[PDB]
Ligand binder design. Structure first.
Ligand SMILES: CC(C)[C@@H](C(=O)N[C@@H](Cc1ccccc1)C[C@H](O)[C@H](Cc1ccccc1)NC(=O)[C@@H]1CN(c2ccccc2)C(=O)O1)N1CCCNC1=O
Lengths: 99, 99
């Protein structure tokens, strides 16, 4: 598909039994999801955004389905206001910027 | 051009005769540049994202040439960690997400 940028490029993603709306975010290195209690091992991390840093939990090799496309990779979980689909997963589903 | 996302989508922009590197950011509503001098009246503004809120200066109707494509629009200036081209100007240069 082609997504214009007149509005936030929000799409439906699925992670396990949870469906959520998330930004397709070319300015995000990583995928940052709102608080959720995912299974398995994780490591603490600090990530920096526009106003400073937040603390997140890094989970590796998490399958996520984005608009019907399969992805699997690192997901950072923490107190973000918005779910962010970062470059690590955007490349997996074939996403490019075009103009 | 078509831009893939294995690297940060950083491009050269021209603003006030100065060349800067800036991030093409579909996850940004607004265009926000690191501290610099621009002419004209600005309006104090606050923006909030991951990590909290910062104070910026809003300049209107500022021309930026992004990768050879001309835009004229609102540019926020402030303590952003990185120069960011947001959706207000991405739409002007015909930028879309495709996969
Ligand atoms: C850039 C501003 C203008 C924007 C905004 O903060 N958008 C964010 C997503 C976001 C977050 C919170 C609120 C609203 C949007 C998403 C952006 O793509 C934003 C751009 C950016 C990049 C680097 C440093 C600072 C900012 N990205 C990010 O903030 C995160 C940070 N992050 C990360 C960084 C290091 C290590 C691991 C992960 C990542 O992958 O994306 N914004 C804030 C004001 C309101 N609207 C808006 O678009």
């Amino acid at each position: 598909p082609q997504i214009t940028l007149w509005k936030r490029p929000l799409v439906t993603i699925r992670i396990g039994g949870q469906l959520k709306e998330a930004l397709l975010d070319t300015g995000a290195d990583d995928t940052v999801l709102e608080e959720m209690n995912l299974p398995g091992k994780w490591k603490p991390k600090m990530i920096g955004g526009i106003g400073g840093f937040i603390k997140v939990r890094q989970y590796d090799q998490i399958p996520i389905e984005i608009c019907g496309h399969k992805a699997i990779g690192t997901v950072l979980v923490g107190p973000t206001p918005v779910n962010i689909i970062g470059r690590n997963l955007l490349t997996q589903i074939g996403c490019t910027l075009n103009f």
